[PDB]
Amino acid sequence: GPSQPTYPGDDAPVEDLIRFYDNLQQYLNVVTRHRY
Amino acid sequence: GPSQPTYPGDDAPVEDLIRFYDNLQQYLNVVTRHRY
Ligand SMILES: [Zn+2]
Ligand SMILES: [Zn+2]
């Protein structure tokens, strides 16, 4: 599946923590085999 | 609102990245004033 996303830092702007959030969501669906 | 969650590490077990995911979700709803 997708490789594990890189955490952008505590001080990353909110738009970068929303991109990271969406990529962790993808990753977690794939690891748990639950692509809903 | 809630204080910014601590990232558990790249090597944290999947259940700990699902807890972090849920707490970042909370945090991001509050920062964006969109508590749906
Ligand atoms: Zn792969
Ligand atoms: Zn507060």
From Swiss-Prot, chains A, B:
Gene3D superfamilies attached to this UniProt entry: 6.10.250.900
Gene coding for it: PPY
PANTHER family (UniProt xref): NEUROPEPTIDE Y/PANCREATIC HORMONE/PEPTIDE YY (PTHR10533), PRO-NEUROPEPTIDE Y (PTHR10533:SF5)
GO molecular function, one term: neuropeptide Y receptor binding
Keyword annotations from UniProtKB, A to Z: Amidation, Cleavage on pair of basic residues, Hormone, Secreted
Entry's localization field: Secreted
InterPro entries in the record: Pancreatic_hormone-like (IPR001955), Pancreatic_hormone-like_CS (IPR020392)
Gene Ontology BP term (one): neuropeptide signaling pathway
Residues that bear Tyrosine amide: Y36
Pfam families: Hormone_3 (PF00159)
Family label: Belongs to the NPY family.
Protein name as annotated: Pancreatic polypeptide
